[PDB]
């Protein structure tokens, strides 16, 4: 759930307790069209960033 930022320097130091997430990026689901009849093939692909 957590990690620690730190500063080490000649002149000074300190430290922080900071949370951590696994939410990273963007998934864009690109279906070929938004309406189908049964026994159609749904084309689909993704753009991930």
């Amino acid at each position: 759930s957590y990690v620690y930022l730190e500063v080490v320097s000649k002149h000074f130091s300190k430290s922080k307790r900071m949370p951590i997430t696994y939410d990273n990026g963007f998934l864009f689901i690109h279906t070929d069209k938004p309406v189908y009849t049964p026994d159609q093939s749904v084309k689909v692909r993704v753009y991930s960033l």
Binding site: Y4, S13, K14, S15, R17
Partner: protein, 61 residues
């Protein structure tokens, strides 16, 4: 007769030095040499959390 010191303790009171303690094995008696060689000694330190008061349930308060 004193004891060796304990392991160095965190620091985080809002007074930031480190706690370390020793306690008396045998006390001075019948005029023998008494103790004043400090019972608890502390030295400088770093704040891993900045001082605040602690609880849970602050949702509705």
């Amino acid at each position: 007769l004193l004891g060796d010191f304990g392991p160095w303790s965190d620091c985080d009171p809002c007074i930031e030095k480190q706690s370390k303690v020793r306690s008396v094995l045998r006390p001075s008696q019948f005029g023998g040499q008494p103790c004043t060689a400090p019972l608890v000694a502390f030295q400088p330190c770093i704040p891993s959390k900045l001082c605040k008061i602690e609880e849970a349930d602050c949702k509705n308060k």
